[PDB]
Every structure is written in structure tokens, then in C-alpha cells.
């Protein structure tokens, strides 16, 4: 039984006021769209979100133009194809959950829009799950078509090994190391479930300094006003 608690990796964003690596965010969106998007969905995160965080405006426009998404009723009422735009959400795999479950043996690939914020462990858990596939030990022979992942609850996951070495050619020129790919996709997922991380830490900085000023001054005002009470020399002169 038991379960591996994901080791606390030294993420660049793990700092109290340290942000995400936006280049890593772009390289992690690339791996998502290349291998992850073939079976997983991101729903809420749309092509418009990528503008200003990982991709520029025209790059995101081209990215949305590459994929064809399904648009509403035709002039005859036919449900037709159409090139994607920024307003469009991330295109999804097999349309209904039943088809996704049937195609992928009997398991539903969860949406990654919140997967790094819905699992106890977050980025550490996701990174360990991806780079943790190991040969099953003695006496724990699993099904056919199943794969032993110690970090997965139940130690029996339904993934064909997602990230293997030299799978995707990064546009920047970074090597296709399995660790590099896993780190990039993990950072992308952390951005995906927390699309305010940069601005949240900015507000944290501003609030910290603002009230590092405010507390001493408000306390000084309180002591200034209360100082009359805290210096009342009393007396008692009964006859």
C-alpha cells in the first residue's frame, strides 16, 4: 500500500516573491500542444490567455490559426469547421467523456486546467508522476495495458508513458531531455491553474511594504492617543 509523498522540488516560483519562468511557460505550452493535447483537455485556458504571458499577439494568432475548431450552425444549419482565433478556447480531445473513456481503455484523462491545483502535491506530484515510471517490483504484477507509477494513488495508472527522452523538438533550441520536458510542462500547468501568479506576488510585495510602513505609524498614533491613560498618576487623599 502506502503512497509516495512528492519531494519538494526547488521550483523557480517556490520563492515567497519569486515568479514563474515565462520562457518555461511557453516551452511547456509547446509540449502540451504536441503530446499532451492529443489526449488531454485544458478547457478554460484559451488561446487569448497565452498573449502577454508566454506568446506575443501574432504568435498566438498563428497558433490559433493552425488548429481547426468546430463552429456553429451553417446557413443550412450544418455544424461546420473553421480556423481558430484568440477568442476560442483550447481545442479538446474526443468530444464527450464516454468517447474519451472508451478510447483510453477505461480511464478519463482529467482536464489540466486545474490538475496542478487539484492534486495534493501540485507541481511536485505532477513532475514525480511523469518522471517516476518504474518497472513493477516482484509480486505486484498488474493488468495488461497497465503501467506501474509509484506516485500515482493505487500504484497502477492507465498512461502510456507520456514523456520519453527526445520526443519534442523545442523551438528555442533547448535539448529534449525528459527532465527538461517534464519541468517545462509542469511550469505550464502551474501557470494554467494559477493565471495570476506574477500579479499575485506583485501584490504581495506591494502589500508587504505598504503595511511595513502602516503598522508602525498606526501603532504610533494609537500610543499617541492612549498616552494620556498610560501616564495617569492617581492619588487618594481621604479625610
Amino acid at each position: 500500500d502506502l503512497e509516495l509523498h512528492a519531494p519538494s522540488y526547488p521550483w523557480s516560483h517556490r520563492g515567497l516573491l519569486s515568479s514563474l519562468d515565462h520562457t518555461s511557460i511557453r516551452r511547456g505550452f509547446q509540449v502540451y500542444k504536441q503530446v499532451c493535447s492529443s489526449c488531454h483537455s485544458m478547457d478554460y485556458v484559451a488561446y487569448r490567455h497565452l498573449v502577454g504571458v508566454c506568446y506575443t499577439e501574432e504568435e498566438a494568432k498563428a497558433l490559433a490559426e493552425e488548429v481547426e475548431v468546430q463552429d456553429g450552425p451553417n446557413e443550412d444549419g450544418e455544424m461546420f469547421m473553421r480556423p481558430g482565433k484568440l477568442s476560442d478556447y483550447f481545442p479538446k480531445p474526443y468530444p464527450n467523456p464516454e468517447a474519451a473513456r472508451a478510447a483510453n481503455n477505461g480511464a478519463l484523462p482529467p482536464d489540466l486546467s486545474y490538475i496542478v491545483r487539484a492534486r495534493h502535491g501540485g507541481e511536485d506530484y505532477v513532475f514525480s508522476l511523469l518522471t517516476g515510471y518504474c518497472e513493477p517490483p516482484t509480486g505486484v504484477s498488474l493488468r495488461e495495458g497497465l503501467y506501474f507509477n509509484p506516485y500515482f494513488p493505487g500504484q497502477a495508472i492507465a498512461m502510456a508513458p507520456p514523456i520519453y527522452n527526445e520526443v519534442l523538438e523545442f523551438d528555442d533550441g533547448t535539448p529534449a531531455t525528459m527532465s527538461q520536458v517534464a519541468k517545462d510542462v509542469c511550469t505550464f500547468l502551474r501557470w494554467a491553474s494559477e493565471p495570476e501568479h506574477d500579479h499575485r506576488k506583485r501584490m504581495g510585495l506591494k502589500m508587504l511594504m505598504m503595511m511595513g510602513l502602516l503598522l508602525p505609524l498606526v501603532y504610533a498614533m494609537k500610543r499617541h492617543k492612549w498616552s494620556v491613560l498610560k501616564s495617569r498618576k492617581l492619588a487618594y487623599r481621604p479625610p
Binding site: 478554460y44 486545474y114 491553474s193 501584490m203 504581495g204 502589500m207 502602516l214 492617543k225 491613560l229
Partner: protein, 379 residues
């Protein structure tokens, strides 16, 4: 001709309630948690309204609406996490306030104490209603378990669960009625808080020493306004740290998964501020006994004025009772932790002992200790 502060109708009430109200001169910081609570209401109500302007209560789109709030609305995540962590701080301040009232003997104010118990029940139900609204896995399943808990009532029990819970399971009707009640209740809380202050005012306030402070009353406005302002700013510090560095620190990650009636999460726990009752529910094996013990865990507060045997209202000069009170607090944290953990061998017995010790302190140990100290002080 005459001062408007003490002649205008509304201004007279404001003046004699907050400006020129004679308050004890030596109230500690623990009393300040009163004002914070009220602030923790307003600060959280204003946020709560702004989510209501982007949250659709339909089950098929509640979670997507919440994600749209956190992802699309201008500064929506600020409002959402401020709301959640403000509820958490509201419960922190409520527990601290009840601890202050129990400690310094304020529970001898009777009407204010019972009104406070009713306020506690109302807000404690309101938070449970609010947790369901995002329609996450924990939201749906915790609502299922907590509502099914009511089925232990004899005879009419199931029928009541047929009525409150909408029949069926936790489904479309349940979400809408939970939203409506979640919206209406805090205004009732506001009215009851106004009644709470109204009952508090003619008695004054209980100073830490427990003695009457009628010989040292000072005006409220010059001193306690700025004192509660500083306290509210400290509460802002804690709330903003929570909201802005670890937004989901006091929360279950699985809530960020859309509710699915086809999969029970590995752990089914309510929010952190409910576990102190949840563990009690697990203490008694019987379902009906669990309901009664869980309700009595909060109903025991109104019995405190009756169970006061010490000749001193306060607790500053009662060291043996002080040890008992701190044992009670430690038992509360132990119960919370036990409720957090699942039901195996190491936790069942600890939870049972913690609940027994809780009740034994409140109804048995504290009055006997007070009598012992009265004897030990030649009275």
C-alpha cells in the same frame, strides 16, 4: 443651539453606541476581536456580493462560473480568495471571541451570550451553505454526508432530509436553495449582531479583572476607535498574507475538481472550522447519538452561565481553572486534528477520549475546580 451628536435621532444612537459609550479602561486586545468580527462581516459581505454578480447558481455551470470569476473578471481572483480566506478568518475570530467570553466570565451577561450562540449557529450554517456553491468534489460530497447526517432523526428524519435536500441527491434544486439561503442569512446575522450590541450596552463590558469598571469608564471614540482600527489592520495583515501568498492554504485541493457523483474522493472532510464538530460526530458509534453529541457540542455554551460556581466572574485569579481552560483549548485543537484524519486504529480512540474530555471539562471539571478554589480562598 444644541449638539447634533446627542440630539439627532440616528446620531444619538451612534453617539451613545460608539462615540461616547463608557467602556472599561483596561480591556485587553482580546476584546478587540469583537469589532474585527463585525468588520470581518462587512469586508466579507462586500466581496460576497461581487461574486454574486458573476456566479450562476445552475449546477451545470456553477463551477465554470467560479473559474470564470477567478480567470476572466478583472481582479476576480482577489475577490474570490478574499471571500474564502475572510470566511476562514471570520471563524478564527469567532473562536477567539468565544474563548475570550468563556475565559473572562463574560458569559454571565446572559442575553448577550445566548444571542451570541444564535449568531454562531447562523454563521456556522452560512459557511456550510457557502462551501457547497462552487460545486467541487469536496463541496458536493461533504454536503451529501452532512445532510445525510440528519437522517438519523427518528420518524420524520428522512422526510426532513427529503425536504431540505430536495429529494434525489444533492442536485440542481439543492444548489439554488443553498445559494438563496447563503444570500439571505448574513442579513439576519447583521440584525442579530445589532441585537447583540443592544443587549451588551446596558450592562457595559466585562474588563479582564472581572470587577465592575464603573469607576474607570472612558469615552469610546478617542481611544477604542483607533485601537480597533489597529486591530482591524492587523487582521488585514493576516488576511492579506493568506489571500496573497498561500491562497489555498486552508483548503482542500480536490475542490478544484468539478463535482462528480460517480466518484467518492479518497477523503471526505469539511472545512477546518467544522472538524471540531465532525470528529465529535465520529466519537459516538450511534448515528442519532452522533447527531445529539454534535449539536450539544455547541448547545453547551448556553449552559455555561448555569455551570458558573466560582465566586469570581473572571479567570485571571483562578490558576487551577486556567489550567483547565487551556486543557480545553488543547482538546479543541486535538479534536480538529482528529477530524482531519481518517478513521483507523490510532484515531478512533483519540477522538473518543478527546470528545469525552471536552464534555467532562465543560460540565464536570470546571465547576468542581471552581468550588475547590472557592474553598481554597476561604469562601
Amino acid at each position: 443651539m444644541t449638539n447634533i451628536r446627542k440630539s439627532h435621532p440616528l446620531m444619538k444612537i451612534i453617539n451613545n453606541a460608539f462615540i461616547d459609550l463608557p467602556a472599561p479602561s483596561n480591556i485587553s486586545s482580546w476584546w478587540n476581536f469583537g469589532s474585527l468580527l463585525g468588520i470581518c462581516l462587512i469586508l466579507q459581505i462586500l466581496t460576497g456580493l461581487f461574486l454574486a454578480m458573476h456566479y450562476t447558481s445552475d449546477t451545470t455551470t456553477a463551477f465554470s462560473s467560479v473559474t470564470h470569476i477567478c480567470r476572466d473578471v478583472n481582479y476576480g481572483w482577489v475577490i474570490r480568495y478574499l471571500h474564502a480566506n475572510g470566511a476562514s478568518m471570520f471563524f478564527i475570530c469567532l473562536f477567539i471571541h468565544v474563548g475570550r467570553g468563556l475565559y473572562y466570565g463574560s458569559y454571565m451577561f446572559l442575553e448577550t451570550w445566548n444571542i451570541g450562540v444564535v449568531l454562531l449557529f447562523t454563521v456556522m450554517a452560512t459557511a456550510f451553505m457557502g462551501y457547497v456553491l462552487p460545486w467541487g468534489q469536496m463541496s458536493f460530497w461533504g454536503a451529501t454526508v452532512i445532510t445525510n447526517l440528519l437522517s438519523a432523526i427518528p420518524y420524520i428524519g428522512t422526510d426532513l432530509v427529503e425536504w431540505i435536500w430536495g429529494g434525489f441527491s444533492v442536485d440542481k434544486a439543492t444548489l439554488t436553495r443553498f445559494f438563496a439561503f447563503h444570500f439571505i442569512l448574513p442579513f439576519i446575522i447583521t440584525a442579530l449582531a445589532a441585537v447583540h450590541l443592544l443587549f451588551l450596552h446596558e450592562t457595559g463590558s466585562n474588563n479582564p479583572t472581572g470587577i465592575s469598571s464603573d469607576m474607570d469608564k472612558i469615552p469610546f471614540h478617542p481611544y477604542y476607535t483607533i485601537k480597533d482600527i489597529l486591530g482591524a489592520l492587523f487582521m488585514m495583515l493576516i488576511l492579506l498574507i493568506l489571500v496573497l501568498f498561500s491562497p489555498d492554504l486552508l483548503g482542500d485541493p480536490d475542490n478544484y475538481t468539478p463535482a462528480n457523483p460517480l466518484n467518492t474522493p479518497p477523503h471526505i472532510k469539511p472545512e477546518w472550522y467544522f472538524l471540531f464538530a465532525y470528529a465529535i460526530l465520529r466519537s459516538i458509534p450511534n448515528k442519532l447519538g452522533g447527531v445529539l453529541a454534535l449539536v450539544a457540542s455547541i448547545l453547551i455554551l448556553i449552559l455555561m452561565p448555569m455551570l458558573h460556581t466560582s465566586k469570581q466572574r473572571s479567570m485571571m485569579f483562578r490558576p487551577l481553572s486556567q489550567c483547565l481552560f487551556w486543557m480545553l483549548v488543547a482538546d479543541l485543537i486535538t479534536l480538529t486534528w482528529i477530524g482531519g484524519q481518517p478513521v483507523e486504529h490510532p484515531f478512533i480512540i483519540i477522538g473518543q477520549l478527546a470528545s469525552i474530555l471536552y464534555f467532562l471539562i465543560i460540565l464536570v471539571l470546571m465547576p468542581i475546580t471552581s468550588i475547590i478554589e472557592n474553598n481554597l480562598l476561604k469562601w
